[PDB]
Design a protein around this motif. Structure first.
Motif, short mmCIF file in Angstrom:
data_model
loop_
_atom_site.label_atom_id
_atom_site.label_comp_id
_atom_site.label_asym_id
_atom_site.label_seq_id
_atom_site.Cartn_x
_atom_site.Cartn_y
_atom_site.Cartn_z
N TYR A 19 0.83 -1.19 0.00
CA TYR A 19 0.00 0.00 0.00
C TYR A 19 0.87 1.25 0.00
CZ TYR A 19 -3.89 -3.09 1.16
OH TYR A 19 -4.85 -4.08 1.14
N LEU A 22 -0.18 8.35 -2.93
CA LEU A 22 0.33 9.10 -4.07
C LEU A 22 0.20 10.60 -3.82
CD1 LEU A 22 -1.36 6.96 -6.87
CD2 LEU A 22 0.89 6.62 -5.84
N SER A 33 -10.33 10.34 -3.16
CA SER A 33 -11.49 9.85 -3.89
C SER A 33 -12.70 10.71 -3.54
CB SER A 33 -11.76 8.39 -3.55
OG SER A 33 -12.29 8.25 -2.25
N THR A 34 -13.43 11.14 -4.56
CA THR A 34 -14.62 11.96 -4.39
C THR A 34 -15.84 11.21 -4.90
OG1 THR A 34 -13.17 13.83 -4.96
CG2 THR A 34 -15.51 14.30 -4.63
N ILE A 38 -18.84 10.94 -12.44
CA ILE A 38 -18.49 11.55 -13.72
C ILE A 38 -19.56 11.30 -14.78
CG2 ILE A 38 -17.00 11.04 -15.71
CD1 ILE A 38 -15.81 13.23 -14.19
N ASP A 39 -20.44 10.32 -14.58
CA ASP A 39 -21.47 9.95 -15.54
C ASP A 39 -22.84 10.00 -14.88
OD1 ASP A 39 -20.64 7.91 -13.90
OD2 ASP A 39 -21.08 6.31 -15.34
N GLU A 41 -25.36 11.43 -15.79
CA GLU A 41 -26.43 11.30 -16.78
C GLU A 41 -26.87 9.85 -16.91
OE1 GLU A 41 -27.42 14.12 -17.37
OE2 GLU A 41 -25.60 15.10 -16.64
N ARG A 47 -18.69 5.86 -12.76
CA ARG A 47 -17.45 6.61 -12.79
C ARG A 47 -17.47 7.65 -11.68
NH1 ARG A 47 -19.57 5.37 -17.56
NH2 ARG A 47 -18.19 4.60 -19.22
N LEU A 48 -16.48 7.57 -10.78
CA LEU A 48 -16.36 8.49 -9.66
C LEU A 48 -15.11 9.35 -9.85
CD1 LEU A 48 -18.07 5.99 -8.69
CD2 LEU A 48 -17.40 6.65 -6.37
N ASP A 58 -4.93 9.62 5.96
CA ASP A 58 -4.36 8.28 5.98
C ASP A 58 -5.29 7.26 5.34
OD1 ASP A 58 -2.84 9.92 7.54
OD2 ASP A 58 -3.06 8.77 9.40
N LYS A 59 -6.60 7.50 5.40
CA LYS A 59 -7.55 6.56 4.81
C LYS A 59 -7.38 6.48 3.29
CE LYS A 59 -11.38 9.82 4.30
NZ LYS A 59 -12.86 9.96 4.28
N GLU A 60 -7.16 7.62 2.64
CA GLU A 60 -7.07 7.69 1.19
C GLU A 60 -5.70 7.16 0.76
OE1 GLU A 60 -9.61 8.78 -0.85
OE2 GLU A 60 -10.89 9.00 0.92
N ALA A 61 -5.66 5.88 0.42
CA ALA A 61 -4.43 5.24 -0.04
C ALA A 61 -4.77 4.26 -1.16
CB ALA A 61 -3.73 4.50 1.10
N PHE A 62 -3.94 4.26 -2.20
CA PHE A 62 -4.10 3.38 -3.35
C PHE A 62 -3.05 2.29 -3.30
CE2 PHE A 62 -7.22 5.80 -5.73
CZ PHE A 62 -7.06 7.08 -5.22
N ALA A 63 -3.49 1.04 -3.27
CA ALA A 63 -2.58 -0.10 -3.29
C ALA A 63 -2.20 -0.44 -4.73
CB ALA A 63 -3.23 -1.31 -2.63
#
Lengths: 105, 52, 52
Positions: A19, A22, A33-34, A38-39, A41, A47-48, A58-63
């Protein structure tokens, strides 16, 4: 730039399947992440949107998950075969195909 | 009743991982099984203190 | 093609044999980015006319 989420061996090499967090060097903002789709419609948006913010959570982490080389090789073979078959389809639609092209197909 | 399980509040942490200082965790009573909670109820005798 | 010539090949070391181990993150590897909190995979695709 990458930031560890756990203790590391004196800043050694990044381990596989580890983990990380970035950050954007130019802006010095961390990814996040929000929920804003994005879609919107679409009846069922999938798509987010993602955004970079100055504050770090600390929660927002990309593995980073490693993919076997075999899977990549199969994907490349599939793409190349699709391209060649598309070319053969175009040739057949034109109405004339060479014997060597037919053998290759 | 004093027994408590320390559990990951973040998806990144997984069971069997080493707890790192500064990590938000969940304390689950073993027998009761209902995690501790800092309720908003305020004690009458004490001012500004909320029950746990 | 194989034929007598004067061409020369300049060997450039992309990666050393020691670095070629599967237990480390190596440049050029194909990886997937997975968001632990939302349990979703980062994706890039064309929505209407532009990649997002």
């Amino acid at each position: 730039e990458l930031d560890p989420t756990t203790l590391q061996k004196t800043d050694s090499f990044v381990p596989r399947n580890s983990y990380v967090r970035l950050r954007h060097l130019c802006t010095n903002t961390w990814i996040q992440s929000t929920n804003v789709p994005i879609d919107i419609e679409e009846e069922r948006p999938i798509r987010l949107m993602l955004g970079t913010c100055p504050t770090k959570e600390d929660k927002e982490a990309f593995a980073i998950v490693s993919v076997p080389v075999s899977e990549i090789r199969d994907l490349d073979f599939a793409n190349d075969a699709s391209s060649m078959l598309a070319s053969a389809v175009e040739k057949l639609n034109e109405g004339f195909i060479s014997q060597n092209d037919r053998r290759f197909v | 009743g004093s027994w408590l399980f320390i559990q990951p509040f973040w998806k990144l942490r997984s069971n069997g991982d080493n707890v790192v200082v500064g990590d938000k965790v969940i304390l689950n009573p073993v027998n009761a099984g209902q995690p501790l909670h800092a309720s908003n109820y305020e004690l009458s005798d004490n001012a500004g203190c909320k029950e746990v | 093609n194989s034929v007598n010539c004067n061409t020369s090949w300049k060997i450039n070391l992309f990666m050393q044999f020691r670095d070629h181990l599967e237990e480390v993150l190596k440049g050029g590897d194909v990886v997937r980015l997975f968001h632990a909190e939302q349990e979703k995979f980062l994706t890039c695709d064309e929505y209407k006319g532009k990649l997002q």
